Amino acid sequence: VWVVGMGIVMSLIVLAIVFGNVLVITAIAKFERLQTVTNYFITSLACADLVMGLAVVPFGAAHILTKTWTFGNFWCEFWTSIDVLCVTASIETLCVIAVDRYFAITSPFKYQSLLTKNKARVIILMVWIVSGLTSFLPIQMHWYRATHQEAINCYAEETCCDFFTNQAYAIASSIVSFYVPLVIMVFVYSRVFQEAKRQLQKIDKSEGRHKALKTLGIIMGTFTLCWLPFFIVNIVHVIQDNLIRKEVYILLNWIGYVNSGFNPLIYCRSPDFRIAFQELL
């Protein structure tokens, strides 16, 4: 009575996640006007979100609904690695975009010298390499496996695919993926808001006879509310075993997934993008 319906919602989530990223990538690729040094980070983020939508969500939906993992253990390990890869890549791309905006606003004269079509590649490649190292190398080499009997039973069985992690890996992944980009983005956006306030006061200083608040608030609040609650229980359940149940953990993790769907709306709303979308259909 409840299983037949939730599949519909899980289907719309996948459909929206795929469609938004596909539209963004097609619009960027097809039209010459949109191509810009800044737009490459958006392309990388859209590609990461597209990979997440095609790979992670559909298999997790079947795992939750069926309550059993029909496939083998190898596919379970590969799926976990892909999920970690996509999540950390998306977060690092957001941090890179924020740093780009900071450099653009703070130093307008030498902005062009720092960023060129050459260094954007290098930055994207280094971000993706750092994302790959933290996910595939620890997981596929079995360095993250736990020690207690329940974890041993879970790993031995070829039907259940549940996440059991060591404390050190969980903490290292938490800081490497979430907290450092959060601090960087907070500092960047504080400086940008202060500069905007100074300019707005300077204009009214001469033109004798609130807007940036909403723009900063949407961008900060969406990311914070979507991802922060998961990266608290991630450490809490490791430190204290009794506190956090598995169901709450899964629910928060799935809330974290939805943040990929909201990215095109937040970051692709310029009139040029609107014209490109209109020309497409």
Ligand X SMILES: CN[C@@H]1CCc2c(ccc(O)c2O)[C@H]1O
Q: Which residues belong to the annotated binding site?
A: 83, 88, 173, 234, 253, 257
**Strand extents, DSSP E, the chain:** none
Instruction: Point out the residue whose Cβ comes nearest to ligand X.
Output: 173
Mark the segment that binds ligand X (CB under 6 A) among 1-9, 26-34, 81-89, 207-215.
81-89
CB of 184 to ligand X, least distance (A): 17
**Which of the residues 147 through 206 are near ligand X (CB under 6 A)?**
163, 173, 177
Angstrom distance (rounded) from CA 192 to CA 215:
12
Binding flag, residue 90, ligand X (CB under 6 A): no
Considering the complex, what minimum distance in angstroms separates the CB of residue 97 from ligand X? 19
Q: Which is nearer to ligand X, 193 or 254 (CB)?
A: 254
Which residue type, as a one-letter code, is found at position 193? F
What mask of x and - would describe binding to ligand X in positions 244 to 273, judged by CB under 6 A? ---------x--------------------
Task: Match 């390499």 to its residue by tokens.
Answer: 129
**C-alpha span between 120 and 122 (Å, rounded):** 5
Residue 71 Cα to chain centre, angstroms? 27
As to burial, measured by CB atoms within 10 angstroms (0-12 exposed, 13-18 middle, 19+ buried), residue 181 is buried
Q: Is 83 in the site for ligand X (CB under 6 A)?
A: yes
Q: Where are the alpha helices (DSSP H) in 3-116?
A: 3-30, 39-66, 73-106, 111-114
Binding part of the chain for ligand X, among 1-9, 44-52, 80-88, 116-124 by CB under 6 A, reads: 80-88
Residue recorded with tokens 């009794």? 242
User: Nearest approach, Cβ of 231 to ligand X (angstroms)?
Assistant: 8
Compute CA distances 44 → 28, 91, 134, 174, whole Å: 11, 11, 18, 22
Verify binding: residue 76, ligand X, rule CB under 6 A.
no
Q: Residues marked as binding for (S)-timolol?
A: 83, 88, 234, 253, 257
Nearer to ligand X, 34 or 89 (CB): 89
Name the residues that contact ligand X, by CB under 6 A.
Answer: 83-84, 87-88, 163, 173, 177, 253
